[model samples]
Target: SMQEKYRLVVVGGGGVGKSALTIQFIQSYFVTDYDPTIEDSYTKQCVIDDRAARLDILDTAFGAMREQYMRTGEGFLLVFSVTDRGSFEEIYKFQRQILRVKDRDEFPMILIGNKADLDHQRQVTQEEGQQLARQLKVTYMEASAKIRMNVDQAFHELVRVIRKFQE
Candidate 1:
């Protein structure tokens, strides 16, 4: 069968609020209820391709156990917080992990420096982030899950790359 479906795997540093980002993107609402992410909890957006039930879409965890899922993912998204230096620094490690499991050329990626609302608390600057993105050869942007700033834009850019690559 032709692979008509695409998969996205979110990865990032711990406590950078990857779970919050995932929920906001998939559900399109801020879930007040907090639930620690579990590997088995993959979501299916059956109508993502069309208003009708056309294709299966999945939005899964960015947690540790989700590493296995990356092997089969069509695209990858690396997220971190602009307010935290450590989170941004670990991006290299995350890239290394992706390189290990996914086809380097086939795996299109986007680097999202989340928590953009907290500008005063920001540890990583926008120029630095963009430079890192240039070095890593992926798109980069700052986002805020709390205020929903560029949140959708980040994911949209990733999907654009996935479609462009068609892998």
Candidate 2:
């Protein structure tokens, strides 16, 4: 029925609820006017120039299978929990490894600060996330796979990035 298919990798700590975002997206790609991000000034938006893509997200495998995972990924969701900055550090780790594996200076990627609803427990501020995203040359977004439901846009945007970059 279609030809546009993308292998998107959700890269970060397991506890960031990476799998849950995949679940929401695969089941229902919902849309809304709801946006709860902290930084509008520095956050970059991945515009949907066109949107006829079907994407497969890789969220389960980690640890030893890491290289093989990145080896086949067309795009990446560099995720971390705002509640814990340790996972924040993991984002840089994954992003660098992906670029290394792809053997390219830059590729289709996004920096996501997950667990946005945990504002009370926030360790990684939007300032830092956006700044890092600027350094990484990718869009920065805050997502709560549990609530606010921006995870759909997260994956959807990566497909846009990949498609746009391929051109």
Candidate 3:
């Protein structure tokens, strides 16, 4: 079977757990400490339904090449920390940039509120995430890379969306 490849980029403010989520998904381990990442790439093999595929996950820090990443990306994961209201709000800026660079009104995107395991420290409610997703016309999910909850689902769902768009 011929497998397809998809480029998925993760974008958000620094310290929002973008790398944590990406690493967790790729290696199945949680990274506790925060390290500001300008840009990093990883490749993971995935099976969407019966189709085999490769996912190129890019973790970015809105650096100089942020726009270039968005321009080349096929799917996007807009991540924000559930404990950080500012991080959640920054998704709006990223969304606008994606639209501008892709020149598309709609694309395969997901809004992820990370740190679901630390709900007590949650500053952005799940309802708010869903509301913004509705407004932006994208799927919404909460994931915890530390506890490994819904992390893979977020990536899988975006890949599914991209697959659907390709069809």
Candidate 4:
């Protein structure tokens, strides 16, 4: 069977668990350190609903070429840390940028609140995330890369939405 390929970029503010969410989803490992990403790309082959698909993910860092990365993606996982308020605020800016670059009022995108494992220190409530997603008209989800929670589902949902957008 031929594999469908989708280019996805995980975009968010620094230390918002973007890379950790991606690495845990693709590699099934938790990252503890706070190493910044510089266009770290990964190809992961996974089966969704019994069909093969490949996701080319760009887990990017805060750089000058941020818009360039957003421009090249077919789909996106806009991530933020549940324990950080500023990260959630940044999601709004990214959403506007994506809409402008993609030139679509609605696009293939997902809103992910990472660090669900650290619910003890959670600043952004689940309801808040859902409320923001509603305002943005995108699917909202929570994940804990440290606990391997909903990490794969977030990516899978993005891929599924991309497939729907193409059809």
| Model 1 regions more than 4 Å off | 1-3, 31-33, 40-67, 103-106
Checking candidate 4 for backbone clashes, the offending pairs are none
State candidate 3's TM-score. 0.94
User: Candidate 3 local accuracy as lDDT?
Assistant: 0.89
Local distance difference test, candidate 4:
0.88
Q: Give the Å error, residue 163, model 1.
A: 1.2
lDDT of 2 by residue, 1-167 (tens): 65677777777774776665665556543223223221111112223556466566676434446787788888888888889889888777788788778899999998888888878999989999999899899999888866645876887778778878978
Name the best candidate (by TM-score): 3
Better of 1 and 3 by lDDT: 3
Q: What tens-digit string does per-residue lDDT give for candidate 3 at 19-123?
A: 889999999998887568457889999887877889999887654477778889999999999999999889899899999888889989999998888979999
Worst 10 residues of 3 by lDDT: 60-69
Quote the RMSD, in angstroms, for model 3. Answer: 1.6
Q: What C-alpha lDDT values do all the predictions have?
A: 0.70, 0.73, 0.89, 0.88
Candidate 1 C-alpha lDDT tens digits along 1-167: 44345566777876565766766766666544465455333444343333222222234434455557777666677888888899899999888777777656436889988888788998999999999999899999888778777766666666678777854
Error of 1 at 31 (Å): 4.4
Kindly give the stretch of ten consecutive residues in candidate 4 with the minimal lDDT sum.
62-71
Q: How many clashing pairs per prediction, in order?
A: 0, 0, 0, 0
* Residue lDDT tens for model 4, 53-105: 98899987833467677778999999999999999999999899888887878
What range of 10 consecutive residues in model 2 has the weakest lDDT sum?
A: 36-45
Model 2 residue pairs with clashes: none
